[PDB]
């Protein structure tokens, strides 16, 4: 359906937006953006040089000049654990032992579009492995998740996926922490680098900033199925477990649900918005609560718009643990990416709205892990006339059993460096301590994970400290009253106990 891509603006593109570009019809602007890559995607289901000019135009933070010039430049590097480098190559891996075979270079078919040159001739089909953003910045906390990963006995392999921001110095010690002292009981990890900068277009490799790189990890990562996690991230179940979720095998994504902050609400102007763009891409309509139930099949999904549309909510996915099935998802995934350098880029924060945002608008089948997200860590007595609070930077994710999964946010206090700034303006802290320097080592302190608050957001919530910065929330448990409790048995407090020991080993 070539006519319409010649029917748009002779200089029409997929662009970065800008601040400075005026946009008097943002919501337009987003349309156009999904719409231009859903009838991409359908008309390669129905003139090579035709096919990379839309591409060009779809795609341009691609380097394509690279791929025609000079291809062995453009594809990107792999580097294993053991310090052997591979180019234009694809890695292979077996899907039972998860350890790894060979690595078939890549033949990169004229007749296939880029995208399905990326399923087919770069990625292997079926091949999992776990995958982190990392620059240098992101060294120790790597560090910790690959500690704890080696005393969960992890067999999956790991890559590292960096654009040209991780010293050699740091993939060393990754190396060296994912390997040395290798047993039954503490497992060297098959751990992979990758480099995508050679992908990248250079007015676009320096436009994937913070939390947008998790969009290069995962797009561009060796696996078809990966599991993204944050360095802040701590799984506390075998890799696998969560492949098993059933909300992955139905729909080949594995979403969890964020905190409710009701503090943080949308303007009516900027739902308006919003209502435009999702009913300009999938005809649904958000005009009133009672026709949002009967146009969405799935509860949970259903839920989830009601929050944002009628509760004026802004965050309801957490990006910390991610699996999407690249098979089932990529253009999905590359929706998600044009809508996080889109107009409404700033209407949520970072990366991890635009998931779930890239699913609905391109009408691709997704859900999310129904179990709301809940505060860890120790269960003081609240005085009333069981009344329990926990305040943490921790946010943790239940089974339906009431198991912990995993959390974001390490296992210290506080990760942040603002000890001088909430000493002088935090009351508990500024009388709890005597200099800056005390609450400093108290947020580098190590976590007690002794239970888990999943509030009630309809009568208490999560409530803001203002500690670690204002990353630190409060929950509340009433028995009979509000929210639920989840009390870790003594078996359980050690397994816990003995995790945070290993994440806090002080490098
Ligand atoms: N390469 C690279 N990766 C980065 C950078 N900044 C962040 N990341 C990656 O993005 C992850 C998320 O950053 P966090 O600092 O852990 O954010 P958070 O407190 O967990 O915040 C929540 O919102 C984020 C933004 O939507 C989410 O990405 C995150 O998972 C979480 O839900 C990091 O762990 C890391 O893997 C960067 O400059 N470079
Ligand atoms: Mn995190
Ligand atoms: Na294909």
Do not use: Q, R, V
């Given at each position: 359906c070539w006519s319409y891509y010649e029917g748009?603006?002779?200089?029409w593109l997929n662009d970065f937006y800008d601040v400075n570009q005026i946009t008097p019809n943002p919501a337009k602007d987003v349309i156009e953006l999904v719409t231009r890559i859903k009838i991409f995607f359908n008309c390669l289901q129905q003139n090579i040089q035709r096919l990379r000019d839309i591409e060009k135009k779809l795609?341009?933070?691609?380097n394509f000049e690279k791929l025609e010039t000079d291809e062995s430049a453009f594809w990107h590097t792999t580097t294993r654990w053991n310090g052997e480098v591979y180019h234009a190559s694809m890695l292979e891996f077996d899907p039972k032992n998860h350890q790894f075979l060979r690595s078939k270079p890549i033949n990169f078919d004229?007749?296939?579009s880029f995208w399905e040159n990326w399923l087919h001739t770069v990625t292997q089909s079926g091949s999992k492995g776990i995958v982190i953003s990392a620059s240098d910045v992101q060294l120790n906390e790597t560090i910790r998740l690959l500690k704890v990963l080696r005393f969960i006995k992890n067999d999956y392999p790991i890559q590292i996926v960096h654009?040209?921001?991780?010293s050699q110095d740091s993939m060393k010690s990754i190396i060296k922490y994912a390997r040395?002292?290798?047993?039954?009981?503490y497992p060297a990890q098959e751990l992979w680098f990758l480099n995508v900068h050679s992908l990248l277009n250079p007015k676009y490799?320096?436009?994937?900033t913070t939390y947008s790189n998790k969009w290069l990890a995962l797009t561009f990562s060796?696996?078809?199925?990966p599991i993204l996690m944050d360095s802040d991230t701590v799984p506390f179940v075998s890799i696998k477990k969560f492949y098993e979720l059933e909300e992955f095998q139905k729909t080949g994504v594995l979403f969890f649900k964020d905190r409710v902050i009701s503090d943080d609400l949308f303007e009516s102007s900027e739902l308006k918005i919003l209502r435009e763009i999702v009913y300009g891409c999938?005809?649904?309509?958000?005009?009133?609560?009672?026709?949002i139930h009967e146009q969405v099949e799935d509860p949970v999904v259903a839920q989830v718009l009601e929050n944002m549309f009628?509760?004026?909510?802004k965050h309801h996915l957490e990006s910390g643990l991610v699996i999407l099935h690249k098979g089932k998802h990529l253009f999905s995934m590359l929706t998600s990416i044009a809508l996080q350098f889109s107009?409404?880029?700033?209407?949520?924060?970072?990366?991890?709205?635009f998931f779930w945002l890239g699913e609905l608008l391109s009408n691709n089948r997704f859900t999310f892990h129904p179990v709301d997200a809940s505060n860890i860590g120790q269960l003081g007595n609240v005085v009333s006339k069981e009344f329990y609070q926990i305040c943490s930077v921790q946010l943790s994710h239940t089974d339906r059993d009431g198991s912990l999964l995993w959390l974001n946010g390490?296992?210290?206090?506080?990760?942040?460096?603002?000890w001088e700034y909430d000493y002088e303006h935090r009351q508990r802290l500024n009388d709890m301590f005597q200099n800056a320097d005390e609450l400093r080592e108290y947020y580098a302190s190590p976590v007690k994970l002794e239970g888990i608050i999943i509030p009630d957001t309809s009568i208490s919530g999560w409530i803001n400290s203002g500690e670690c910065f204002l990353f630190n929330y409060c929950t509340l448990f009433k028995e009979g009253e509000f929210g639920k409790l989840i009390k870790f048995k003594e078996d359980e407090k050690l397994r816990l106990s003995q995790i945070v020991d290993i994440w806090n080993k002080d490098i």
């Open positions: 748009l603006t002779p200089g795609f341009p933070y691609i004229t007749g296939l654009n040209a921001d991780l040395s002292l290798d047993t039954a009981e490799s320096k436009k994937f060796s696996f078809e199925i999938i005809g649904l309509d958000l005009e009133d609560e009672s026709k009628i509760k004026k909510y107009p409404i880029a700033e209407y949520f924060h970072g990366d991890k709205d390490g296992l210290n206090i506080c990760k942040k460096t603002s």
